[PDB]
Structures are given as structure tokens and as C-alpha cells.
Amino acid sequence: QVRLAQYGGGVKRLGATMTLSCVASGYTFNDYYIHWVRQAPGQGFELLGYIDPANGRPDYAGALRERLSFYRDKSMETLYMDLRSLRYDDTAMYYCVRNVGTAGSLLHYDHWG
Amino acid sequence: VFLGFLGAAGSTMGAASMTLTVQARNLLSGIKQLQARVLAVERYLRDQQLLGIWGCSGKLICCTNVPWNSSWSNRNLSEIWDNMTWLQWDKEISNYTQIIYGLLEESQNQQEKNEQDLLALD
Amino acid sequence: VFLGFLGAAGSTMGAASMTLTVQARNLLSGIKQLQARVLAVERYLRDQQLLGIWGCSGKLICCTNVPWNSSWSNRNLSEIWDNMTWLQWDKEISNYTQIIYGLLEESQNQQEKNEQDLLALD
Amino acid sequence: VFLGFLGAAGSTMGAASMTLTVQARNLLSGIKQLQARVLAVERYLRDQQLLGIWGCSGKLICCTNVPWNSSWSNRNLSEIWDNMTWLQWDKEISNYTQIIYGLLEESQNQQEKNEQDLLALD
Amino acid sequence: ENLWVTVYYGVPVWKEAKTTLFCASDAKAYTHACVPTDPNPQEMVLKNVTENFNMWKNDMVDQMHEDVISLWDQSLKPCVKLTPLCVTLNCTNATASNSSIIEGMKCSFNITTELRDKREKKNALFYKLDIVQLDGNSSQYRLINCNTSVITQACPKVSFDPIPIHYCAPAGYAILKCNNKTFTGTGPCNNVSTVQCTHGIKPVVSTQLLLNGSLAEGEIIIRSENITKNVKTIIVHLNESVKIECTRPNNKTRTSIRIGQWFYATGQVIGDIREAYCNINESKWNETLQRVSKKLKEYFPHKNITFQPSSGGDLEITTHSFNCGGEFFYCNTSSLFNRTYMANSTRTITIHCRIKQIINMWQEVGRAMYAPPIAGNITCISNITGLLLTRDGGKNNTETFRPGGGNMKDNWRSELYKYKVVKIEPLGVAPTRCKRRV
Amino acid sequence: TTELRDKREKKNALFYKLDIVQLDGNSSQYRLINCNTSVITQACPKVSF
Amino acid sequence: RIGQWFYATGQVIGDIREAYCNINESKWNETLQRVSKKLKEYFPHKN
Ligand SMILES: *[C@@H]1O[C@H](CO)[C@@H](O[C@@H]2O[C@H](CO)[C@@H](O[C@@H]3O[C@H](CO)[C@@H](O)[C@H](O[C@H]4O[C@H](CO)[C@@H](O)[C@H](O)[C@@H]4O)[C@@H]3O)[C@H](O)[C@H]2NC(C)=O)[C@H](O)[C@H]1NC(C)=O
Ligand SMILES: *[C@@H]1O[C@H](CO)[C@@H](O[C@@H]2O[C@H](CO)[C@@H](O[C@@H]3O[C@H](CO)[C@@H](O)[C@H](O)[C@@H]3O)[C@H](O)[C@H]2NC(C)=O)[C@H](O)[C@H]1NC(C)=O
Ligand SMILES: *[C@@H]1O[C@H](CO)[C@@H](O[C@@H]2O[C@H](CO)[C@@H](O[C@@H]3O[C@H](CO)[C@@H](O)[C@H](O)[C@@H]3O)[C@H](O)[C@H]2NC(C)=O)[C@H](O)[C@H]1NC(C)=O
Ligand SMILES: *[C@@H]1O[C@H](CO)[C@@H](O[C@@H]2O[C@H](CO)[C@@H](O)[C@H](O)[C@H]2NC(C)=O)[C@H](O)[C@H]1NC(C)=O
Ligand SMILES: *[C@@H]1O[C@H](CO)[C@@H](O)[C@H](O)[C@H]1NC(C)=O
Ligand SMILES: *[C@@H]1O[C@H](CO)[C@@H](O)[C@H](O)[C@H]1NC(C)=O
């Protein structure tokens, strides 16, 4: 029932800045943390960071805290990600994923984009 | 707890009086629907206090004073007691239950006052 | 049922005690007005459970332990029993009802435990 | 009235049984908050009628038929009776309380029918 | 053998369950104002009672949250709606000398006011955080939330304050109160006590830290969930209260516009202009931070501890947020969270702070509130009691804790940890060697 | 008038004529069928009862 | 938008048909016969 569509992408020129997005179908926008995970070709997945949709708090992996940026527009139930100065190795596929959170902890991913 | 809730109907007075606990137990469980709880509580409490006023709260069956008359149901029922279900019996006696209740209540008062007067000699 | 609801007043307590059933019966019958039913049920149940805790659920008049001494109502009322019509006696003894209730409750506990200890030899 | 409302816990079972009136008394006192009164009344009335069905309404402690089994809690409780709180004993017996209740209720029916048959010789 | 069944009523045995709890209000005040009655809750220490607690799991925090929402809704319901004020704004904002701070200045627009055939020009001031820029000429502005929600002005006569609230269980339910002095939010309590009602809890509303609450018995206490290290929020509870003071020294002028509902706006400011700010006992602050660091590196064995201000997010989380009466604050908290560590009123700190009127409702967006201006200069004083921290994962070999706690439920989570509610089970059975007599 | 109360704006959409009633004069003039007699509430799509 | 989102019908896609329904002919054709047989029980001797 729940859907996480995505847009943006395609080719991006070297050194440029690029913007993805995910549109959250109606489940409840404020209750579930959203994570941005990616997969280089011929490699295992890895996490970039997570953004709480409610207050917009981001948090990033240590190796990309200079280059990343997350933020949201709660009215549209829409999310955005900005990655600055693409390098060659960042050629990869990028996913949104909903997170199942308890009252005080974050557990795992259930529905992928 | 719900099994054969009114199933004792149809049968003799005696056997059908075996299941009376099955019925006695029943006071169970939009926003406007809350009043059903109050209605059930009202019914149960009114019946219970009436049995208290007749001095018959502590039992499901008990005897009292004020013998039967040719008045009220001018009937012989001990032979019909076996083969008659309660529905007809209630239909027959509803004409006079209201008269009988006052006699029962005053009998309880007489009993308790006599017992108190006997107690007064303690 | 409604007749002489408080008419027992004025008369002696003994004659007034004849009509106690008439008062005892009454727990009867905008959307904001529903709470009256709950209030009446609350009153009746609280009084009934208090009589239960004193071992006096099953009677309109019953008997218990511990006396009146010079403390509490420092009075002789038996001659005034035929002169009192309750209300002024109630005013007099309201000073000490709260004291009496605890003694009544503990007396019921003593009776129950003594009877259980006697039962323990079964 | 509020004092030691659960202080009986921890102590031996009988000593805890000394205070049962203290817990028994408690049926006391936004517009949406009215339902708490109904909830309390429901709990109290359901427990009271269950004790009535077991013929044990009139007491805080009483005995019935249907003796204990090596099944259920296969315990020598009487020695541990001076060690352990109701929490542990209630936890132990919760697996079988529901079994026991039907037996107690049917025992009450047997007692009532036997007593009624004895009265029928009047 | 021959152990006959016996029954006992009034039993001391209970179980956990949810239920609807009574609130309770003060005898004096401004559903809530007069009722429920002010209690006199007592308390016993129970001898050998051993009960488990879980301050994350318990239900009544959610009930607190829902009741707070409902009370705010009821209070806000009769107030005026500011829908007709949504018209285009044509404002240039260069009149007073100290223009740049506010940049909404007599800010002009049209309103229908007395007669519905008429339409009249007015103007008033606004802080630019309550405004968004339309395309084209910058003079074209709009109210921030008016394209997304309907804005209600707060009823000035019904000003609401953190009045303490006592919560009382109904008959058949008892509230268990752990008296342990070093309780971590989970695990057994061997010092169980019971009460009619909880003490008077206030509905504090703040972010990154809380301003009015209770204090710990031992030293500063750390409470966090322990399912996984990847936690959402970590609660640090102070024993040593620390004073904080704040001011809004500029004098405001109230002005009124009628729709006949009286809308209130900000008139011309009086006196020379300062930026609203706060103060902190400087030595006390990073003495307390040293204590918190020492406590915090207990859990985390052999890794450094460091603080930085929050990054990203709305103004409600990037800054400490609170309210002096009928005004709201957002204080730029960089200086307070910049220490680093490794394995008594001198030198007073000051921190800059901004105020804005149009507040998205704290618990959730989509409904908007407008606070009318408070005339004159304002100061309020509070004494903080705890911090709401969150850990940045990922970075190997270096922990990092930053002020979060924007989710309003956590404030009451950090205060209702004391209690639990249990259903009473008065009826029980036991074997005994005596039966009925015929 | 969409969001700015000073800005009336033209739009258009489709309707089935059973939801439409003709006004006098030019047939181009129509009205919503029930608007002269009642107030119309759009169904909440998320409900979908 | 009025911020209430009103929904209307946009441009129709694909070639147009009139909405319709389907019924198995013989099933209805016999069901009416059964209903007629039942119905003339109540009413004695009329078509
Ligand atoms: C009510 O009005 C508010 C503003 O007053 C409005 O909020 C704005 O929404 C837009 C998008 O809906 C946000 O725009 C984003 O801005 C960031 C930088 O600030 C950009 O990185 C984003 O870029 C993406 O989106 C563009 C399309 O908008 C793409 O062209 C681009 O390539 C990227 O994919 C994006 O532009 C804007 O930040 C907010 N404003 C605020 C203050 O938050 C709100 O949406 C309105 N209500 C409704 C229901 O729409
Ligand atoms: C808890 O925080 C609140 C504020 O968030 C503190 O309460 C506020 O205290 C100030 C004085 O310290 C009060 O100011 C006075 O208010 C009256 C009433 O309007 C006014 O007439 C005076 O001129 C003065 O301004 C203020 O009202 C009061 N409440 C609010 C909402 O600000 C409180 O002190 C903090 N707790 C502790 C223990 O200090
Ligand atoms: C809270 O207070 C701190 C100050 O202690 C604020 O940090 C400051 O934020 C400004 C934002 O403009 C930073 O300016 C930066 O300048 C560089 C050029 O040197 C530019 O490339 C950046 O884009 C940015 O504009 C400034 O450096 C920074 N100061 C420090 C010491 O970090 C912080 O923004 C305040 N936060 C809030 C929410 O008010
Ligand atoms: C409280 O804070 C002040 C301000 O930081 C501390 O003094 C400075 O600490 C920094 C490092 O945090 C040093 O680089 C400075 O040299 C210190 N002095 C000054 C004048 O800035 C102060 O030591 C702290 N108090 C305690 C008790 O630790
Ligand atoms: C923390 O202090 C260091 C000291 O050099 C400074 O460079 C840095 O900007 C400070 N950060 C904040 C957020 O105040
Ligand atoms: C079925 O319907 C057709 C309609 O053309 C009718 O001619 C025919 O008589 C019906 N079937 C029977 C068995 O009569």
C-alpha cells in the first residue's frame, strides 16, 4: 500500500551538484525516519544518512559530512537530497527507505523506494 | 461466559431451574453508545435490591410467607409444573406479580421486626 | 412506587422504622443530564457496601458490637426515642458517626477471623 | 479513606488478610472523563456478583466444596504460606482459577438444590 | 489432602494495564480552570514490594500528550480566525533607524473592517521570520502559513501558563511510584511506594533542554533506551539546578484592528533597540558540562566526548526554544555546546536570541497560531533541570552529542518516569482444610 | 480566488452535464446543479468509505 | 487549491466508450421465469 516514488537522476557531469527527491505516499509523514542508502556497482550497499521528516534533523556518515545535505517540505510530503561535487566513484544507484522506529530507538527498514 | 443462555426455556420448572446461574452471570463488557452500560447496571441493581427487600438476595431460590390464594392464578400447577415452560407461566402470573410483591415486602418487615423484638431480650 | 417518602419523620423512631422499605426502594428510572443516574447508583452502592463491610448487608436493621459510654452522645435517649424524630438525634450523633464506623468495621473483621479460626478446626 | 492501600503486600498471607477491608472500601468519588466512574462500578459489581454466585457475598473469607487437587499448583503452600506474597501465589494459581470457578458455582447450585429439597418436606 | 477450596476478597495483588486517568487543577487559575478538585495526595513506603518499571513503555505519557493537545484546542477554539488578513502585503520597511532587525514596518495592506462595502488601508510591524517573499518586486510579501493553514490569534484574556497538574487514578487502579534514587528508566525498583495522585507536573514547552522541572536525587542521571545503541534521544537529568535569565528590553506598542473581532498587531517600538538575549552563570555551566561528560563516558568505555550545536532542521531545533509569557524565543545556542573532552557566578555568558510571532503548533504542523504582541519590555527567569541529547553515529573513534529533542513528547517522557499504573485484582483463592457446613 | 484574496484567476475543468444546469439567455451560462439549494462537500478521498 | 485541495476531472485519455454492464443472458432469462412462478402463487389467476 505504502509507496515511495523517486525522481531525478540520469547523467550528471563531473564536479556538478545534483538533486534527488522522494514523494511519500500517504501513511503518516511524521512518524517514520527516512534513510538514504546507495549501492555502487559490484559492491554492497552502504548508508549516507537519515533525516527525521518531522523536525528535519539530518545526520550523515562520517566520510561525506562535507558534501551531503538533506531537507524536507512537510506540506508536500516531499524529501530532497543534495550531493555536492560529484566524483567518479559516486556513480551508483540511490534509494529512499522507510524506517520502523519505536518510542526511543530505530530498528530497521521495511519498505524500499 | 456464554453458553445455552436462554436454552433452558421449553423445559420443566425443575430442570430449567438448574441453569439459572448461566443467566445470573450476565453483566458483562460512536461515543453516544455508552449508555448501554448504565442501562444494564440499572437493571441488575434494581432486581438485586428487590430481592434484598424480600430478604432473598443471598439465594437463587427461596421461600416466603403469605400463602397462595384461590385469587391470583386460580390454578393447579403442580401437575402442569412438569410440562409447562416459563413463558406461559410468566404470561399467566404477570396479572398479579405486582400485587404479590407488596405482600412479600411487608412479610419481610414482619419477620425482621419479630426477630429484632426477640433480639431485644438479649 | 412513591408514597410517604419522608412522611415517617415527626413520629417516634420506632414507628418511623416501620416504613424503611419505602425509602429503601427508591433507585428508579438534554444529553448532559445523564450523570444523575450515575450519581444515584454511586450513592446506593456506597451505602450498600458500607453495610456489607459492617456485616449488615442482609437487613434493614441489624445488631453489632461496642457500646455507647459517657463519651460520644453523653445521653439517655430511650425515653427521648418517643420524642426525637431522628433529625435532631442525627445532628447530635453526627459528631461521632465517623468514629463509630471504624470500630464497626474492625468488629466485623474480629467476628470473621474468630469464625474462620473456629472453622479451621473442621 | 486512604491508608496502607496495598501495604499488606510482602507479609504472610493471613497478616495480609488482616487488612482486606482497607482494600474493599475503595469505590469512591474534561467532560470525557465520566467513564472512569462507570468502569469502577463495573469492576466492583462484577466481583460482587461473582462472590454471590459462589454463595460467598456476605463474607470476606469463606469456604466451599470441591477439594484441592494434586493437579493445579502441586504445592505444599501451607509452609510457604508464611513466606510468599499474593503476587507469587496469584501468578502460580492464575493458570487454574478459571477452572476452579465453574466448580465453585456448580457446588453452590448443588447446595441450593439440596437445601430446597430439604425445605420441600416442610 | 482434604484441602478444601477457600476464597479471599480485598486481596493485595495487581497487574499492569492501561486506563483513563483523572487530571487535577489548582484551586486558583486564570474542564481545567475550576476542575478537577485540588488533591492532598498521601504516600506510603511499602515494605518488600518489588516491581519493574519502564519509562519508555508506559501508556500515560501518551495520555498526557493527548490531554495537552485537547486542552490547547479547547482554549484556542473561541478565538478569532485571521483568514481575512491573508491579503497581499506591499511593504518596504525602512522607517525607523534600527530597521534591519525587524524589516516589517509601517507593513501595509487592505482589510474590509467595519462596512463590507468598504476597504481600508492599514499597516503594522512584523518580524521577517513571520513573512515570505513573493516573486517579482520584493515589496510583495505573504504571511508564512497562510498558503497552507488557517491562523488563529491567541485569546489574550486566556493567557495560559505552566500550571502544575496532578494525575489521579480511578477506583480499582493504583499508581506505583518508584522511590529509588538512582533509577535509570528500566529495571526493578525495590523501594516501591504508592499514592492517590502524582505531584504537580507542569506542561513545560521547550526544545534542546527543559526549564522548570524536578531534580535528581543522586548526581546527574543518564536515561536512554537500551534496545540498540542507535538511539533517538538521550535524557540527561540534572541534580544541581542552574539558573537562566532572559530579556526583551525593547518597549512594544500594541495596536488594534477590528474585523467586530479585535485583531492585535505590533505598533511602533519605543526606546532604543537591542537584540533580545539571555544570560548564564559561566563557571556553573561548564562545571555542569564536565560532570555530564564524566557521567556520559561511563556508558561509552574508551572514546572521546565532544559537543557541537545542532545542524539542519527548523528553528525549533536549531535553537533553544521557550517563552517568556506571551512571547516566544529562539536563542542561537552555539557557545554553550562547543566543549571537548578526552579520556561561582563570574564572567557571565550572554547569547543572542530572536523572537517570532507565528508559531506552527509544537506537536505537529498544519495548524497555525499567532501570538499578539506584549507591550513594554519583558524578562523571565527559569532554572533548567536537564538536557535532551542525541548521538551522531557513523564517526568511528569519536562520539558526538548535539542538542536535539524537538519532539514535544520527550519533555513529558523525561518527567513521568516516576510512575506506573496497575489494575487491582482483589479476588483470589487458596487451599485450606475446611469446608462449608450443610 | 486561490490563495491571495486580491487575485481572482481563471481555471477550467470537465463536468458531466447531469451535474450542470443551464441559465437563461446564452447557453454558455451554466450553474452547479445544487448550488441554488444546498452546500456541496467534496468527499474526503483519503477516507474512501 | 482554495489551502484545501479541490479535485476536478482533467483531460480524458484514450478513445471514448460509454460505460456499460454485462449479464449472463440465460441466467437472468431463467431467474425471471422462477420469480414469475413464485409470484403467481400469491396472485391466483392473472397474467
Ligand atoms: C506554501 O509556501 C511555502 C513558501 O512560502 C512553500 O514552501 C516552499 O516549497 C518549495 C517547494 O515546494 C521549497 O523549494 C525548495 O527549496 C530548496 C532550497 O531552499 C531547493 O533545493 C528545492 O529544489 C528542488 O525542487 C525544485 C522545484 O521546487 C527543483 O526545481 C529542484 O531541481 C529541486 O528538485 C526546492 O526548490 C521551498 O524551500 C519551501 N519554502 C520554505 C520556506 O520552506 C510551501 O510548499 C507552500 N505550500 C504548499 C502546499 O505548496
Ligand atoms: C518556569 O518558567 C516560567 C517562565 O517560562 C517562570 O514563570 C514566570 O516568572 C516571571 C517572574 O520570574 C513572571 O513574571 C511576572 O508575571 C506577572 C503575571 O503576568 C507580571 O504581572 C509581572 O509583571 C511579571 O512579569 C511570569 O509571569 C511567570 N510566568 C511566565 C509564563 O512567564 C518560572 O519562574 C519558572 N520556574 C521557576 C521555578 O522559576
Ligand atoms: C548559532 O551561532 C553560530 C555562531 O557561533 C552561528 O554560526 C555561524 O553561522 C554563519 C552562517 O552564515 C557562518 O557563516 C559562514 O561563513 C562562511 C564564510 O566564512 C560561508 O562559506 C558559510 O556559508 C557561512 O555563511 C559562520 O561561520 C558560523 N560561525 C561559526 C563559528 O561556526 C550559527 O549559524 C547560529 N545558528 C543559528 C541557528 O542561529
Ligand atoms: C568554563 O568556560 C571557560 C570558557 O571556555 C573556560 O575557560 C577557557 O577554556 C578554553 C577551553 O575550553 C581555553 O582555551 C581558554 O584558555 C580558557 N580561558 C579563557 C579565558 O577563555 C573555563 O576554564 C571553564 N571553567 C571550568 C571550571 O572549567
Ligand atoms: C568551537 O571552538 C573552536 C575553537 O577554535 C572554534 O574554532 C569553533 O568555531 C567553535 N564552534 C562553535 C560552534 O562555536
Ligand atoms: C430468453 O430471452 C429471449 C430474448 O430474445 C427470449 O426470446 C427467450 O424466449 C428466452 N428464453 C426462453 C427459454 O424463453
Q: Determine the straight-line distance between the first and last CA of chain G, rounded to whole angstroms.
A: 59
If residue C76 lies in a helix (H) or strand (E), which one and from where to where? none
Task: List Cα–Cα distances, B86 to B15, B63, B81, D12, E96, in angstroms.
Answer: 12, 19, 9, 51, 94
Sign of CA dihedral D39, D41, D43, D49: negative
Domain at A5, CATH number: 2.60.40.10
Q: Which is the closest atom of ligand 5 to the Cα of E335?
A: 14
Report which protein residue has its CA nearest ligand 5's atom 10.
E338
Pairing of strands E151-153, E368-370: parallel
Rounded CA separation E320/E322 (Å): 7
What is the number of domains present in chain A? 1
Bridge partners, B73 (sequence order): none
**Residues with beta carbon inside 6 Å of ligand 5?**
E 308-309, 334-335, 338
Q: Radius of gyration over alpha carbons of chain G, in Å?
A: 23
Is the CB of C120 less than 8 angstroms away from the CB of E435? no
Calculate the alpha carbon distances from E269 to B61, E198, E246, E371, F2 in Å: 86, 45, 19, 17, 35
Binary contact (A106, E310; C-beta < 8 A): no
| C-alpha torsion angle, residues B34, B38, B40, B41 (rounded to 10) | 140
Whole-number CA gyration radius for chain F: 14
Give the closest residue to E58 by CA, choosing from E9, E99, E5, E21: E21
Eight-state DSSP code of residue B34: G
Q: How many CB atoms lie within 10 A of CB E82?
A: 21
Q: What's the half-sphere exposure (Cβ side, CA atoms, 13 Å) at B51?
A: 14
- Burial pattern E406-431, b for ≥16 Cβ within 10 A else e, equals bbbbbbbbbbbbbbbbbebbbbbbbb
Exposed/middle/buried for B88, CB within 10 Å: 0-12, 13-18, 19+? exposed
Location of C-alpha cell 441488575? B44
Task: Return the residue of F nearest to E140 by Cα.
Answer: F4
Separation between Cα atoms, residue E155 and residue E369, nearest integer Å: 10
Q: Domain span at residue A19?
A: 1-113
Write down the number of H helices and E strands in chain A.
0, 9
Which of D2, D19, D20, D21 best tests the C interface by mutation, with the highest count of C CBs <10 A?
A: D21
| Cβ atoms of D44 and C48 closer than 8 Å | no
Quick one: CA dihedral C23, C29, C30, C32, positive or negative? Answer: positive
Q: Are E358 and E145 in contact (CB under 8 A)?
A: yes
Secondary element (H or E) of residue E30: none
Let me know how long chain E is: 438
Name the closest-CA residue to atom 3, ligand 5.
E338
Please name the residues in contact with D59: beta carbons below 8 A apart, sequence gap of 6 or more.
C112
CA distance G9 to G6: 10
Residue B47 at interface with chain C, using a CB cutoff of 8 Å = no
Distance between CA atoms of G44 and D6, rounded to whole angstroms?
A: 80
> What SS3 state is found at F36?
coil
CB-CB neighbours of D87 under 10 Å: 18
C83's grid cell: 420524642
| Integer Cα distance of A8 and E8 in angstroms | 71
In this complex, whether C and B touch, counting 3 or more CB pairs under 8 angstroms, is yes
| Edge-to-edge strands, sheet with E428-432 | D61-63, E4-8, E428-432
The span from the CA of B46 to the CA of C25, in Å, is: 9
Q: Which of D82, D113, D91 is nearest to D17 (CA)?
A: D82
Contact A47, A61 (CB under 8 A): yes
SS3 track for chain D: CCCCCCCCCCCCHHHHHCCHHHHHCCCCCCHHHHHHHHHHHHHHHHHHHHHHHCCCCCCCEEECCCCCCCCCCCCCHHHHCCCCCHHHHHHHHHHHHHHHHHHHHHHHHHHHHHHHHHHHCC
G11 to chain F: closest CA residue: F14
Could you give the C-alpha distances from B52 to B60, B109, D115, in angstroms and in order? 12, 12, 20
CA-to-CA distance for E373 and E255, rounded, in angstroms?
9
Task: With CA atoms as reference, report the closest residue to B55 among B98, B115, B120.
Answer: B115
DSSP C122: -
D61 CB neighbours in chain C (<8 A) are 112-113, 116
Q: List the grid coordinates of E381.
A: 527567569
Q: Tell me whether residues C21 and B58 touch, CB distance under 8 A.
A: no
Among candidate residues E299, E389, E379, the one with its CA nearest the CA of residue E336: E389
| DSSP-assigned beta bridge partners for residue E320 | E331
d(CA C86, CA C92): 10
- For residue E139, CA distances in Å to D41, E50, E96, E109, E126 come to 66, 68, 17, 11, 14
Take residue D65 and report the three cell numbers written for it.
466444596
* CA angle E418–E420–E423, rounded 5-degree value: 160
Instruction: Note the ligand closest to the C-alpha atom of G32.
Output: 6
Q: Are A29 and A74 in contact (CB under 8 A)?
A: yes
Does residue E411 have its Cβ closer than 6 Å to ligand 2? no
CA C49 from chain center: how many Å?
Answer: 11
- The set of cell numbers assigned to E256 is 488594534
Report the alpha-carbon distance of residue E416 to residue E63 in Å, rounded. 11
Structural method = cryo-EM
**Quick one: angle between helices B35-53 and B86-120, nearest 10?**
60
Residue numbers of E between 104 and 133 with CB closer than 8 Å to F = 110
Torsion of CA C36, C105, D6, E424, to 10 degrees: -40
- Shortest Cα distance from C66 to chain E (angstroms)? 24
Q: What is the largest CA-CA distance in chain B?
A: 61
Per the CB < 8 A criterion, the answer to whether E175 and F37 are in contact is: no
